[PDB]
Amino acid sequence: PYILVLYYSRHGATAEMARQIARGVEQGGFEARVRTVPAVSTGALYATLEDLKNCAGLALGSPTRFGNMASPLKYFLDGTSSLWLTGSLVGKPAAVFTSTASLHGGQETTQLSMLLPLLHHGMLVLGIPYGGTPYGASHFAGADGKRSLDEHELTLCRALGKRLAETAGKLE
Amino acid sequence: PYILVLYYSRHGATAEMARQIARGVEQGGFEARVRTVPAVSTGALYATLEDLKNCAGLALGSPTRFGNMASPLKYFLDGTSSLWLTGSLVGKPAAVFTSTASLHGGQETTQLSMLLPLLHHGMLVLGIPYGGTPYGASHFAGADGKRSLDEHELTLCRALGKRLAETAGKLE
Amino acid sequence: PYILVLYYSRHGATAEMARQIARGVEQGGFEARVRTVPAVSTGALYATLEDLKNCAGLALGSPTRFGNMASPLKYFLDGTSSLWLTGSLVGKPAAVFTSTASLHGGQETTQLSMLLPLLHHGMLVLGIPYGGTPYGASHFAGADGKRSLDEHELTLCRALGKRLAETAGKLE
Amino acid sequence: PYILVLYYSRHGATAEMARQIARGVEQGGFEARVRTVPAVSTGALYATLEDLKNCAGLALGSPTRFGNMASPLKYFLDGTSSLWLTGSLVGKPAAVFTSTASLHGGQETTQLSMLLPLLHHGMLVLGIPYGGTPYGASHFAGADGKRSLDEHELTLCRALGKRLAETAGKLE
Numbered sequence: 118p119y120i121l122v123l124y125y126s127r128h129g130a131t132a133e134m135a136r137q138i139a140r141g142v143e144q145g146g147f148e149a150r151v152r153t154v155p156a157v158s159t160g161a162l163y164a165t166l167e168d169l170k171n172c173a174g175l176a177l178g179s180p181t182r183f184g185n186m187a188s189p190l191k192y193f194l195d196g197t198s199s200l201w202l203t204g205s206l207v208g209k210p211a212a213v214f215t216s217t218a219s220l221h222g223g224q225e226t227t228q229l230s231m232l233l234p235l236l237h238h239g240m241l242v243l244g245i246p247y248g249g250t251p252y253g254a255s256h257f258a259g260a261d262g263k264r265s266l267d268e269h270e271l272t273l274c275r276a277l278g279k280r281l282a283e284t285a286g287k288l289e
Numbered sequence: 290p291y292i293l294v295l296y297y298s299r300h301g302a303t304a305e306m307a308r309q310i311a312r313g314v315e316q317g318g319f320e321a322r323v324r325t326v327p328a329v330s331t332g333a334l335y336a337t338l339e340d341l342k343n344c345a346g347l348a349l350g351s352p353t354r355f356g357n358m359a360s361p362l363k364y365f366l367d368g369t370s371s372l373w374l375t376g377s378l379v380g381k382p383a384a385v386f387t388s389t390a391s392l393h394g395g396q397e398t399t400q401l402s403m404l405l406p407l408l409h410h411g412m413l414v415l416g417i418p419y420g421g422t423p424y425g426a427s428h429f430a431g432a433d434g435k436r437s438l439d440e441h442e443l444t445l446c447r448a449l450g451k452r453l454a455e456t457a458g459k460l461e
Numbered sequence: 462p463y464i465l466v467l468y469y470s471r472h473g474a475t476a477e478m479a480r481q482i483a484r485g486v487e488q489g490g491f492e493a494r495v496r497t498v499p500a501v502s503t504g505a506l507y508a509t510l511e512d513l514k515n516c517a518g519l520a521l522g523s524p525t526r527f528g529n530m531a532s533p534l535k536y537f538l539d540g541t542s543s544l545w546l547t548g549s550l551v552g553k554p555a556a557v558f559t560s561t562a563s564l565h566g567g568q569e570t571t572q573l574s575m576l577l578p579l580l581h582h583g584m585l586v587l588g589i590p591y592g593g594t595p596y597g598a599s600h601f602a603g604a605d606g607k608r609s610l611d612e613h614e615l616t617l618c619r620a621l622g623k624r625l626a627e628t629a630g631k632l633e
Numbered sequence: 634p635y636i637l638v639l640y641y642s643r644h645g646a647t648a649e650m651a652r653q654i655a656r657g658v659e660q661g662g663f664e665a666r667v668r669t670v671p672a673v674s675t676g677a678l679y680a681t682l683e684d685l686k687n688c689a690g691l692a693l694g695s696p697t698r699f700g701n702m703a704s705p706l707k708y709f710l711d712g713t714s715s716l717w718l719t720g721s722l723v724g725k726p727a728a729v730f731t732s733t734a735s736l737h738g739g740q741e742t743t744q745l746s747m748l749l750p751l752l753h754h755g756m757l758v759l760g761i762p763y764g765g766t767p768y769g770a771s772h773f774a775g776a777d778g779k780r781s782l783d784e785h786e787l788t789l790c791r792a793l794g795k796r797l798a799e800t801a802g803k804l805e
């Protein structure tokens with residue numbers, strides 16, 4: 118009965134997108150469990166392996182950091198061999214979303230790169246039909262970082278959340 | 290009641306994979322409509338826009354040519370604005386497959402690059418869970434080109450065909 | 462003494478970018494040979510294999526068609542086995558550029574996908590440092606298609622042309 | 634006078650590749666500074682920002698973890714805004730390398746995904762001309778993990794190291 122909305126956020130932009138996507142999910146006929154991951158070294162409650170194992174589907178979100186997802190997120194996925202092994206996530210639908218400092222700061226490629234692990238877990242990936250890209254939702258935040266979630270972005274975040282939920286519905 | 294198995298093949302390697310994938314589809318509870326595309330300039334029956342519009346799901350296959358799909362295939366997709374526009378393929382599951390001259394001649398990247406258009410058409414993409422990659426089926430054919438479809442490759446082609454069909458089944 | 466500026470264009474948007482990139486090249490200390498490819502089925506002079514073989518470096522441009530380059534371009538590259546074989550382009554610098562109907566219509570991914578063949582030919586690829594992306598130049602043309610080349614886009618086209626030329630200069 | 638050979642390794646496979654690449658570099662007319670990164674949570678000396686700032690070129694290596702680089706590596710790159718900002722690495726050549734548990738466990742895509750940050754730093758990327766792929770060196774280590782670096786893999790690691798060094802030489 119839930120879609121996991123899993124994300125990392127440093128200055129709140131991705132956190133905001135997560136919340137909007139969650140709402141999409143709810144109007145897709147599903148409950149949204151929004152969870153984040155702890156910072157690493159040498160907004161929301163923390164995710165555990167259970168949240169992943171028992172989700173019906175998943176939205177994965179990160180700020181774009183040099184064309185890839187953020188390392189606290191990567192670190193969380195890095196701990197999922199067990200799920201890989203017994204093969205959960207297999208068959209469950211998934212979508213990604215990202216926040217960016219420039220208009221063309223490589224969201225598409227960050228979204229691309231984030232679809233990869235989900236394909237390793239054998240999930241079913243989907244984007245947005247016909248920020249915001251065909252691969253998932255993106256938000257543009259400016260060098261400033263303060264630019265708030267605009268009209269179409271917020272709308273697209275919800276569309277994705279919804280589509281994800283309905284897909285999880287269809288698959289039963 | 291059909292999955293479209295759409296491919297281009299020049300010396301038969303991809304044609305063979307198409308046939309094996311078709312069989313997977315049949316054992317997934319669906320009929321396989323195998324279709325190819327005509328060579329361009331300046332194995333199977335030709336595909337038409339109808340085959341695409343009315344499929345329940347789709348397998349797309351091409352030999353890897355410099356990291357991308359073959360241009361006769363690309364040319365066929367290039368003619369699908371109309372479907373894009375009214376938004377068919379939207380919601381329907383899809384998977385890719387490729388044939389290669391070397392072990393690591395970039396199948397993954399060709400498969401990647403082929404998933405892109407399907408995401409532009411708003412399809413749901415899936416690979417192989419836990420040649421053959423997590424992104425779709427690949428066959429290794431050698432510089433020679435004669436190396437035939439091996440045991441695990443043939444098995445993986447069928448798995449994909451099947452998974453595709455069952456997914457299309459689940460989505461109803 | 463020349464950089465090949467090789468592109469396909471259907472309604473002139475990419476043709477325009479090619480010209481702007483050519484100018485960048487000239488101010489990089491090199492002559493720009495701008496060439497296109499003939500349409501296929503079943504702006505500039507046509508490119509031949511000689512243009513490729515004897516260039517010092519290369520800019521490759523196409524409209525984004527479903528996340529990939531256009532099939533007339535692909536068809537031209539499809540005819541370069543011979544060069545692949547004897548290994549020209551090996552060592553020579555390359556960059557890409559693309560034109561798009563939407564803001565986030567997948568330029569990055571089209572640019573990505575276009576870098577792939579150049580890597581198969583063993584070229585050295587470069588983007589834009591610190592439309593327009595880090596992977597190459599993009600132009601946004603609108604659903605309309607009439608939106609002309611804007612200030613920063615035109616500037617970025619030239620930067621790339623220049624950087625390409627200077628790199629080819631450095632490599633000697 | 635040095636190429637930075639920067640990598641993360643957990644069970645030594647990537648560490649081995651780093652060493653072989655280093656040797657390639659030396660025979661390319663350059664000194665190889667091999668450096669790793671510390672594990673994160675919530676083989677070689679550690680890299681510092683200085684190693685990056687003052688390298689003439691760079692090889693980046695990681696085990697493939699779900700289609701992406703390892704999070705300790707990502708975390709190190711995650712700390713390079715400053716270099717991004719003042720624009721070092723800009724103009725310097727770069728190549729990647731990866732180690733994998735399966736034959737087609739997505740090295741190409743991991744290599745791809747690793748080229749992305751280097752393009753954000755405005756480096757010049759190169760692969761292998763005409764494991765081992767056109768995008769960089771890969772090693773196959775088996776589910777076991779014990780499979781040692783084979784003949785052609787070891788040879789390809791050196792080729793890349795060498796090509797990288799010579800390129801850095803040419804650029805001066």
Ligand SMILES: Cc1cc2nc3c(=O)[nH]c(=O)nc-3n(C[C@H](O)[C@H](O)[C@H](O)COP(=O)(O)O)c2cc1C
Pocket residue numbers: 125126127128129130131132179180181182183184216217218219220221222223258262710711712713714753
């Ligand atoms: C080290 C790091 C790398 C970044 N790399 C990029 C990038 O390559 N392209 C871009 O547009 N923005 C980049 N940014 C900006 C972030 O994407 C931006 O801060 C993000 O929208 C904030 O997300 P958050 O508020 O959820 O933490 C980077 C930021 C950091 C801290």
Ligand SMILES: Cc1cc2nc3c(=O)[nH]c(=O)nc-3n(C[C@H](O)[C@H](O)[C@H](O)COP(=O)(O)O)c2cc1C
Pocket residue numbers: 297298299300301302303304351352353354355356388389390391392393394395430434538539540541542581
């Ligand atoms: C122009 C062209 C480009 C090719 N590029 C690659 C490549 O980059 N990597 C590779 O491993 N094989 C490459 N090949 C080999 C084909 O992938 C191989 O012939 C394929 O398996 C045959 O597929 P088919 O029999 O269905 O036509 C290329 C072949 C042609 C004709």
Ligand SMILES: Cc1cc2nc3c(=O)[nH]c(=O)nc-3n(C[C@H](O)[C@H](O)[C@H](O)COP(=O)(O)O)c2cc1C
Pocket residue numbers: 366367368369370409469470471472473474475476523524525526527528560561562563564565566567602606
């Ligand atoms: C069949 C085809 C596919 C296209 N696919 C996309 C696409 O996926 N994303 C996008 O933004 N625009 C897409 N477009 C719009 C083109 O990218 C746009 O027309 C381009 O800027 C024109 O380039 P040209 O004038 O050089 O021919 C497509 C156009 C055609 C004809």
Ligand SMILES: Cc1cc2nc3c(=O)[nH]c(=O)nc-3n(C[C@H](O)[C@H](O)[C@H](O)COP(=O)(O)O)c2cc1C
Pocket residue numbers: 194195196197198237641642643644645646647648695696697698699700732733734735736737738739774778
């Ligand atoms: C969590 C994690 C994720 C992994 N993901 C993949 C993968 O998707 N594909 C693959 O072939 N191997 C995968 N592996 C295997 C590693 O790539 C393999 O252990 C690597 O060759 C070891 O590198 P190292 O000895 O330098 O640490 C993964 C291993 C770990 C620990």
